[PDB]
Design a protein around this ligand. Structure first.
Ligand SMILES: [K+]
Ligand SMILES: [K+]
Ligand SMILES: [K+]
Ligand SMILES: [K+]
Ligand SMILES: [K+]
Ligand SMILES: [Mg+2]
Lengths: 112, 116, 31, 90, 306, 119, 75
RNA sequence: GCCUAAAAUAGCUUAAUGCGUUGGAGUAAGGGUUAAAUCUGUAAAAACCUUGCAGAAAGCCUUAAAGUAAAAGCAGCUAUUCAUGCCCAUAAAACAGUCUAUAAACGAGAGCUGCGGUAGCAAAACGGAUUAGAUACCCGUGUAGUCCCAGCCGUAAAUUAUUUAUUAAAUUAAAGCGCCUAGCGAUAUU
C-alpha cells in the first residue's frame, strides 16, 4: 500500500479542528501588517487589534446563544479595558494612536 | 414427596414480619404473619410473635413436603434472627442465606420527620 | 443583631401583615 | 500481600473497555473503593471512576452483584481457556 | 380561560392583538395567517363547489337545527381522507390553506403518476408539514409525520390522527385542531387505542392512520370581540329558557327554574345519559370517558329492576 | 479530531453487521474524513440484559471504528445509530490528537544532533 | 446481593456474615438516609454530629493505646 | 497538547418507587400509634414470580469544597459550542492603576401569567385521636406548589468592609468611600 500525503496534510491543517481554533488562527494572520517584527505578539498595536477582532467574531455568536451570560460578562470587561488603553496612547503617543484608529476604522473619541 | 426444595421470603420493615413459602419457580404455597397467629396491633412487634409465626409456617411446609429451603431476607430488623432460628430448630434444613435489601441510586423524596 | 432584637421586630411585622390582608378585599382601605 | 498495579500501568490501561483491569479497584460487592484504599493520585482516581460509570451505561458492568448473572464467572473462564489454546496453536 | 392580562402582554407569536381603539376591538384576538405561511385565498377550482346555505332546515322545510343561518357565502372543499388511490406515488405539498368550515388546515398536494398528467388532492395537514414537503402512503413508507400506514406497522407510543374505524371507508376519528390518539397494545386482530376524549376502544388492525397531530395549535387562544363576528360565520342568537313564557319552555313561568334543568322537551340535562344501554357497539368499547367500565354502563338499570 | 465509536448490535448475521458498519463509514467519507481502524469482537455476553418494549437481549455483537473528521460528524453518526434498529447501544468518545508531545519530539531531535556532533 | 452459605448447619455463623456485609458495604447507611428527608442544611449538621462522635471514640482509644504500649497493660 | 463540581445546547443509562397494569400461584388480613381508630381488603388485597406504562432523582467514587463560579452557586454518562486552569516554549522602546458621586447588569426559596407534565413529597382542605379545651404537635387521604419552556417580581440570618506596605496571622501607618449620634413611635406627605 502507498502512503497518502494528501490525508496527512488535511489532518495537520485546520480542517479537523474546533471553530474557536480556526478563528484564532485568522486573527493572528490579520495582524501581520501592524506588528513590529515577525514575532511581536505583545505590542500595543497587536493587543488592541486582537481585542477588536474578538469582539467582531462574538457578535454573531451571542445572537444565537442569548443565555450564555458568563461569556457576555467577559466580553464586557475586555470592552472597557480597550477603551482605557486607547485613552492612554492618545495622551502620550499620538502617532501610534493614529495608526491603530486608521487600520481598524475607528473614530477619534478617546479623549478625557 | 419430601424431596422438595423451596424458598422462604422474610420481609421485615420495622413494624411487622411477613414470611412466604414459594417453590423454585416463584409460586406461593403458604404464608404466615403474626396477626394470623393471634398477635395484634401492639403485640405484633414482640420476638415471641415472630417465633410463633415461624413455627406455624414450618409446620405447613413439612406437611407439603418441603424439607430443604433457602432464605431470602429483605430489610433490616431484629425479628429475622428469631424467625430463622425457629425454622432451623423446627426440623427444616437451611442451605443458604441471601440478603436482597434494595438500595436506591437517588430515588424518591421520603416523607418529613416526626416532630414528636 | 441579637436574638432579642429580632424578636422585638417580629411582633410589629406580624401586625402590619395582618392589617394589609384585611384591606386586600375592601372598597375603602382602613388607614 | 495483594497485587498492586503501577501508576504507569493505570494511565496506559484505564479505559472503560478493560473491565478485567478495572475490577481491581472495586469492592467484592462491586462498589468503587475510596482513594485512601486504592493509593492513587487525584487525576487517576477520577479516570477510574469515570471508566466504571461509562462501562455501567454500556452494560459492560453492573452497579451491584446480581443473582441472575452468577454463571458469568464460569463463562469467562471457559472463554479464556479457548483463547489461550487458539493462540498457542497458532 | 381568557384574561385581559393575556391580551396586554401580547406574547404568543402568530396572533393578531388588535389595539383597543373601539369598544368592539378591546377584547378581540385573531390569527395572523401571513406570519404562519397559511394561504387564505380562493380554493382550487377542480376541488371546490358553491352550494346554498341550508340554515338548519330539512327537506320538509322545518327548522331541525336551531340558531343557524344568515352568514356569508358558503363554498365547500373536497378532501381525500383515505389516500389509498395514490399509495405508491409520492406527493409534493404546494400550499397550506385555511378553510372556514373546519378548525384544522388543509394541504394541497400534487402527484405525478408515471405516464399520466399531474393529480391534485386536498389532505388534512399534519402538525409539522410545510410547502415543499413530500408525503407518502402505503407499504414501504417511513414512520414520520404525514405518512399513512396500517395499524400493523405503527409503534405503540406514536401519536396518530385521522383514524379509520372501517378498513377502507376513510379516516373519521381524530380530525379537530391539535388532537391525536395513541396505541396502547395490539392483540391478535385488534389494537387498543385511546381516543382524544379518553375512551379506550378496539379497532381492527387493518385500518389506517396518519402519523402526527392536526395542524392548528392556536385554536383555543381566539376571542371574538363582537356579536357580529359570529353572525358573519352563520350563527344566530338564542334566548334563555327562563326568559320565555310557560307555553314556550318548561322554564317559562315567572319564577326562575321551578323544576330541575331540562331540555325544551323536558329531559334532564345535568347528567342523564342518552346513549342506548343495549347498543350493539358495546362489544368494542372497553372503558368509557371518565373511566367507567362498559359493563357498569350496560347493566345499571337491570340490577335496579331486580 | 480523532473519534472512536463502540457499537453493541444484535447477534445477527454477518451481512447485517457489515451493512450497519458501512453506513457509518460512508457518512465519514462523505463529510470529508478517513477511517483508521476497523475491528470486531464477535458475540459477547453482557453484565445485564438489554430490554426493549417486548424483547430481552442477554448478548450482543460488538465492533469498533476509529476515524478522523470535522466536529460536525458526531451528530451525523448519532442520527444513524438511532435510525438503525439493529443497533442496541452506542457511545462516541474523543481521543488525543497526537501520540507524541512536542517535548518528546524535541528530545529525539536533540539526541540525533548530539550523535552527529560527536561523530 | 450477598449470599452466605451454611456449613454444618451453623446458621449463627451465616447470620454473622450477613451483618458484616451490611456494615462493610453500606446497607445500613442507605436505610438511615431514606427513613425520612432532611434539607441539605440540616443534613450537614447531622453529618457533623456523627463525625464528632467518631472522633471522640478515636481520641479515647488513642489514650488507651499509649498506656498499653508503654506500661504493657494486658487489657 | 491536556484538564475542568464553570455556563449554554443536544443525545443516552436505571437502582428504587407508584398504579381503576397483564398472566400464574395462594387466603385473611394490610397499614399505623404512648395506646387506638379513620383508611385499604376478603365481591380475592398485602406478601411471591412475571407484563406494560410513567415521572422525578442521581448509591459507591465523595472530601473539604482544596472550583472559588463575582455573588446567587456547582459532582449520572457522552458530545458540541464557549470560558478557565495546568505543563512546555515564546512576546512588548513610549500604552494598562486604586476607589466610586452617578448609572447599569446578574441575582436562592417563596409568589404571579401563559404552555406542557404530574410518580414521590406536601401549604390549604376534609376525617380519626390526644386534651379541661387542641382551633397545634401525632395518624389517614390530599389540591396548589415543587418539574419543562417563555415572561414578570428583585426580596433573605443574600459570606469576612475595599486598596497599598509589613505580617503565618496579627500589629502599625496611609488612600478613596458608605453608615451611626439614647430609646420609643406612621401604610404620614412626596
Ligand atoms: K342567551
Ligand atoms: K317557572
Ligand atoms: K428569586
Ligand atoms: K434566608
Ligand atoms: K456609633
Ligand atoms: Mg316577559
Amino acid at each position: 500500500q502507498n502512503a497518502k500525503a494528501h490525508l496527512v496534510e488535511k489532518f495537520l491543517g485546520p480542517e479537523f479542528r474546533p471553530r474557536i481554533k480556526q478563528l484564532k488562527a485568522k486573527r493572528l494572520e490579520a495582524v501581520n501588517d501592524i506588528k513590529r517584527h515577525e514575532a511581536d505578539v505583545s505590542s500595543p498595536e497587536v493587543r488592541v487589534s486582537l481585542m477588536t477582532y474578538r469582539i467582531r467574531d462574538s457578535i454573531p455568536l451571542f445572537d444565537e446563544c442569548k443565555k450564555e451570560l458568563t461569556g457576555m460578562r467577559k466580553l464586557e470587561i475586555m470592552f472597557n479595558k480597550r477603551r482605557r488603553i486607547l485613552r492612554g496612547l492618545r495622551k502620550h503617543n499620538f502617532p501610534i494612536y493614529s495608526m491603530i484608529i486608521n487600520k481598524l476604522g475607528m473614530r477619534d473619541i478617546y479623549s478625557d | 414427596v419430601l424431596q422438595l426444595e423451596g424458598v422462604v421470603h422474610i420481609l421485615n420493615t420495622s413494624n411487622n414480619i411477613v414470611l412466604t413459602l414459594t417453590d423454585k419457580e416463584g409460586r406461593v404455597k403458604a404464608w404466615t404473619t403474626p396477626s394470623s397467629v393471634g398477635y395484634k396491633n401492639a403485640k405484633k412487634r414482640l420476638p415471641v410473635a415472630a417465633e410463633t409465626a415461624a413455627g406455624e409456617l414450618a409446620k405447613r411446609a413439612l406437611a407439603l413436603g418441603y424439607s430443604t429451603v433457602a432464605v431470602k431476607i429483605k430489610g433490616i430488623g431484629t425479628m429475622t434472627q428469631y424467625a430463622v432460628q425457629m425454622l432451623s430448630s423446627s426440623g427444616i434444613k437451611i442451605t443458604q442465606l441471601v440478603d436482597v435489601t434494595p438500595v436506591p441510586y437517588g430515588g424518591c423524596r421520603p416523607s418529613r420527620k416526626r416532630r414528636v | 443583631i441579637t436574638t432579642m432584637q429580632w424578636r422585638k421586630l417580629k411582633i410589629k411585622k406580624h401586625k402590619l401583615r395582618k392589617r394589609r390582608k384585611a384591606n386586600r378585599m375592601r372598597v375603602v382601605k382602613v388607614r | 500481600f495483594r497485587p498492586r498495579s503501577t501508576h504507569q500501568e493505570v494511565t496506559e490501561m484505564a479505559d472503560f473497555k478493560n473491565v478485567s483491569f478495572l475490577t481491581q479497584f472495586l469492592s467484592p460487592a462491586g462498589r468503587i473503593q475510596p482513594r485512601r484504599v486504592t493509593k492513587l493520585t487525584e487525576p487517576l482516581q477520577r479516570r477510574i471512576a469515570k471508566s466504571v460509570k461509562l462501562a455501567r451505561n454500556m452494560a459492560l458492568m453492573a452497579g451491584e452483584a446480581r443473582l441472575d448473572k452468577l454463571h458469568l464467572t464460569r463463562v469467562r473462564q471457559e472463554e479464556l481457556h479457548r483463547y489461550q489454546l487458539k493462540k498457542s496453536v497458532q | 380561560k381568557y384574561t385581559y392580562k393575556f391580551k396586554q402582554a401580547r406574547a404568543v407569536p402568530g396572533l393578531v392583538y388588535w389595539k383597543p381603539r373601539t369598544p368592539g376591538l378591546r377584547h378581540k384576538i385573531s390569527i395572523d395567517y401571513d406570519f404562519l405561511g397559511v394561504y387564505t385565498g380562493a380554493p382550487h377550482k377542480d376541488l371546490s363547489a358553491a352550494v346554498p346555505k341550508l340554515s338548519g332546515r330539512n327537506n320538509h322545510g322545518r327548522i331541525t337545527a336551531r340558531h343557524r343561518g344568515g352568514g356569508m357565502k358558503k363554498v365547500l372543499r373536497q378532501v381525500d381522507y383515505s389516500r389509498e388511490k395514490v399509495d405508491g406515488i409520492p406527493g409534493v405539498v404546494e400550499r397550506v390553506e385555511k378553510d372556514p368550515n373546519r378548525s384544522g388546515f388543509l394541504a394541497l398536494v400534487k402527484y405525478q403518476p408515471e405516464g399520466q398528467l399531474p393529480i391534485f388532492k386536498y389532505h388534512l395537514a399534519p402538525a409539522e408539514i410545510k410547502a415543499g414537503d413530500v408525503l407518502l402512503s402505503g407499504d414501504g413508507a417511513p414512520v414520520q409525520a404525514g405518512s399513512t400506514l396500517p395499524l400493523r406497522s405503527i409503534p405503540l407510543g406514536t401519536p396518530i390522527h385521522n383514524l379509520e374505524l372501517t378498513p377502507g371507508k376513510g379516516g373519521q376519528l381524530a380530525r379537530a385542531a391539535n388532537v391525536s390518539a395513541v396505541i396502547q397494545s395490539k392483540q391478535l386482530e385488534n389494537a387498543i387505542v385511546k381516543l382524544p376524549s379518553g375512551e379506550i376502544r378496539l379497532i381492527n388492525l387493518d385500518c389506517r392512520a396518519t402519523v402526527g397531530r392536526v395542524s392548528n395549535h392556536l385554536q383555543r387562544m381566539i376571542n371574538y370581540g363582537k356579536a357580529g363576528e359570529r353572525r358573519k360565520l352563520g350563527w344566530r342568537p338564542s334566548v334563555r329558557g327562563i326568559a320565555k313564557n310557560p307555553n314556550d319552555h318548561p322554564h317559562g313561568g315567572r319564577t326562575n327554574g321551578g323544576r330541575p334543568s331540562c331540555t325544551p322537551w323536558g329531559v334532564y340535562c345535568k347528567g342523564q345519559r342518552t346513549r342506548r344501554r343495549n347498543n350493539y357497539t358495546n362489544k368494542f368499547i372497553i372503558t368509557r370517558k371518565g373511566g367507567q367500565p362498559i359493563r357498569k354502563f350496560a347493566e345499571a338499570k337491570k340490577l335496579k329492576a331486580r | 479530531p480523532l473519534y472512536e465509536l463502540l457499537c453493541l448490535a444484535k447477534p445477527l448475521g454477518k451481512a447485517e453487521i457489515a451493512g450497519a458498519m458501512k453506513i457509518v463509514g460512508q457518512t465519514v467519507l462523505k463529510r470529508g474524513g478517513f477511517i483508521t481502524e476497523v475491528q470486531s469482537y464477535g458475540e459477547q455476553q453482557l453484565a445485564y440484559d438489554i430490554r426493549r418494549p417486548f424483547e430481552i437481549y442477554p448478548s450482543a455483537h460488538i465492533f469498533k471504528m476509529e476515524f478522523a473528521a470535522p466536529t460536525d460528524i458526531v451528530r451525523l453518526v448519532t442520527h444513524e445509530m438511532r435510525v438503525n434498529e439493529n443497533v442496541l447501544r452506542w457511545v462516541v468518545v474523543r481521543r488525543p490528537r497526537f501520540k507524541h508531545t512536542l517535548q518528546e519530539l524535541l528530545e529525539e531531535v536533540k539526541a540525533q544532533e548530539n550523535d552527529d556532533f560527536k561523530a | 446481593a450477598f449470599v452466605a452459605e451454611v456449613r454444618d448447619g451453623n446458621v449463627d455463623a451465616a447470620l454473622a456474615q450477613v451483618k458484616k456485609y451490611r456494615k462493610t458495604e453500606g446497607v445500613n447507611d442507605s436505610v438511615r438516609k431514606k427513613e425520612y428527608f432532611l434539607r441539605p442544611s440540616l443534613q450537614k449538621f447531622r453529618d457533623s454530629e456523627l463525625t464528632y462522635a467518631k472522633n471522640m471514640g478515636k481520641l479515647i482509644h488513642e489514650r488507651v493505646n499509649w498506656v498499653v504500649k508503654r506500661k504493657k497493660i494486658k487489657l
